[PDB]
Design a protein around this ligand. Structure first.
Ligand SMILES: Cc1cc2nc3c(=O)[nH]c(=O)nc-3n(C[C@H](O)[C@H](O)[C@H](O)COP(=O)(O)O)c2cc1C
Ligand SMILES: Cc1cc2nc3c(=O)[nH]c(=O)nc-3n(C[C@H](O)[C@H](O)[C@H](O)COP(=O)(O)O)c2cc1C
Ligand SMILES: CC(C)(C)CCc1c(C(=O)O)[nH]c(=O)[nH]c1=O
Ligand SMILES: CC(C)(C)CCc1c(C(=O)O)[nH]c(=O)[nH]c1=O
Lengths: 313, 313
């Protein structure tokens, strides 16, 4: 019975990794994730310059999940590139590097410089398509023209296989359009579904107040709130992008949640809110729990059930 | 203390009502809602002709909420109009009629016929800006030009105060654009936020199957999953539409949940999943719970805290 995966020319002991932004901002974080039982790790989404991000409190968690408006705090590209180039031990597990430039030019400049490190060390790029574009316009992945622009430019400037982190969609027309745009780009080898469910609002009844400071309390939702949304998106893209991989992210607290992602079509499975709350010990528990479900059902490998969700009739 | 209120030239004993589509399809259902302790009721969204809707199972509920792809099953406009004009007892509570024609023309045809009944009897219109998938086009409230068209045409055809049922948005630009569109129409006097969160996917781990039959298991989410989404939309529209009322819908199981909706800006508070699950007795509990929260805080009226959620600095 086996949780191993071989994909994108790397070998992974198991499908679990952190979700970008959780336990991956500092060298200490990245070493912690590397020491954990996860099968891979991804670095905090970065910008060309270091950023302090938004005022605190900017993340809060609750029994049903989390809300955040972190504002892209990060040590800057040079740091994550140096981590990839010189510090990460690839004999432990594969590394993904997430980038989230504030304009297309910023993303192009970073991917040009990551390319030789990707070639030499095998660091994998996750391009964060919830990067904000011009203020007053929707996030890039919700503006299909901008999305196409970003993927054109990045494909040309990078020239190697990469992946994209997608926000959740809620309309079949959007699944259809988004997947078609992604399918225009052969170097997009994986699609990570999903980022946080945008601009929720958590209110504390006792204090009659919002719980995070930025944006009058509005922020991205993770955790139990978003599992069915995440599963839908994983399956919508799995079905629409048959020559790509789908990585699942959202609402994973247990091997059963991970099993559902995989049935929906997930290859790798990312863990955000639950990892933030539980810490990196969660990866042993998830592995154990998933292996137990597999043993009860008689499945020996992940590919025996990946994408095999049954429909009715 | 009593929680009676005055909106849209009607008097309401309390802010609670069913959400459209729940306990409101047949004459029996409407009679049951009238006999409940709810402050108002709304009828199932109707089309010009009767519809059977989608194959069953088409609704499923779980501890954290529900998923549905009912397919607009309804008895047809003639039935709801007849209910409004001859059967409903207006001395018990106000009635809202939801319409959801499949084209602008169908909606116009229905509203022309509702107008004289709204004049004579005081039935209120909730126009549902959600529809079945049509390949190649987004849902109407997600296509801002189509939405402005529906509203121009209905406003002209109806000529009386009405409200609109909105799907959730997830992007601040979208809030700004949608609110701008609604504010073009002075007859749109209330906005109901929100309809179900579109196209989630619930999978049963034991059977490895989706749980509803239509649309390969994809359907709208309600219940606990959507409360922060619902609060965000209530508050975003309450902020952006100062000359309209906002009605909250989404994730209400307790007086505390309703309290949060009212804090975010809700005038009326609609109950969908929790009503479907618990039955019409839920309304006495919700009132009791909301009055208890008010009494412990020293609030004597809804007006004292409606829209008064606090932000941090
Ligand atoms: C504190 C925090 C920071 C995040 N930062 C990033 C980020 O830098 N880049 C990114 O793609 N997603 C980011 N996300 C989104 C997570 O990667 C993830 O998509 C989302 O939380 C959903 O998964 P979950 O339900 O496991 O939390 C962040 C989430 C949290 C809670
Ligand atoms: C079984 C079912 C039928 C529904 N039918 C309609 C409808 O006909 N018109 C409509 O505007 N919303 C309809 N909805 C959406 C609800 O009115 C409501 O917006 C949604 O369920 C969110 O509220 P909740 O969290 O209380 O369930 C329906 C929901 C359910 C669960
Ligand atoms: C949302 C952005 C600030 C534009 C990018 C980073 C990010 C953050 C964040 O740093 O605020 N939070 C998330 O939930 N998802 C993200 O992708
Ligand atoms: C979704 C439609 C079928 C387009 C309209 C009726 C409706 C339904 C429905 O009848 O399936 N379900 C909901 O969650 N919201 C709705 O507004």
């Amino acid at each position: 019975m086996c949780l191993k995966l071989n994909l994108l020319d790397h070998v992974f002991a198991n499908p679990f990794m952190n979700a970008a932004g959780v336990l991956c901002s500092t060298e200490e974080d990245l070493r912690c994730m590397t020491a954990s039982s996860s099968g891979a790790l991804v670095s905090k989404s970065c910008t060309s310059a270091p950023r302090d991000g938004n005022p605190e409190p900017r993340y809060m968690a609750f029994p049903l999940g989390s809300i955040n408006s972190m504002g892209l705090p990060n040590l800057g590209f040079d740091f994550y590139l140096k981590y990839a180039s010189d510090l990460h031990d690839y004999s432990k597990k594969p590394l993904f590097l997430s980038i989230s430039g504030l304009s297309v030019e910023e993303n192009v400049a970073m991917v040009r410089r990551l390319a030789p490190v990707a070639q030499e060390k095998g660091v994998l790029l996750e391009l964060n398509l919830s990067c904000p574009n011009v203020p007053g316009k929707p996030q890039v992945a919700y503006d299909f023209e901008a999305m196409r622009t970003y993927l054109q430019q990045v494909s040309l400037a990078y020239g190697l296989p990469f992946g994209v982190k997608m926000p959740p969609y809620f309309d079949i027309a959007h699944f259809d359009t988004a997947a078609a745009v992604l399918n225009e780009f052969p170097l997009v080898k994986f699609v990570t579904c999903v980022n946080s469910v945008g601009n929720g609002l958590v209110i504390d009844a006792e204090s009659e107040s919002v719980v995070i400071k930025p944006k009058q309390g509005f922020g991205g939702l993770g955790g139990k709130y978003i599992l069915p949304t995440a599963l839908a998106n994983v399956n919508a893209f799995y079905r629409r992008c048959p020559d790509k991989l789908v990585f699942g992210c959202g609402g994973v607290y247990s091997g059963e949640d991970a099993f559902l992602h995989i049935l929906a079509g997930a290859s790798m499975v990312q863990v955000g809110t639950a990892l933030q709350e539980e810490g990196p010990g969660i990866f042993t528990r998830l592995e154990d729990e998933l292996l137990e479900i597999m043993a009860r059902k008689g499945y020996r490998t992940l590919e025996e059930f990946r994408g095999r969700v049954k429909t009715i009739e």
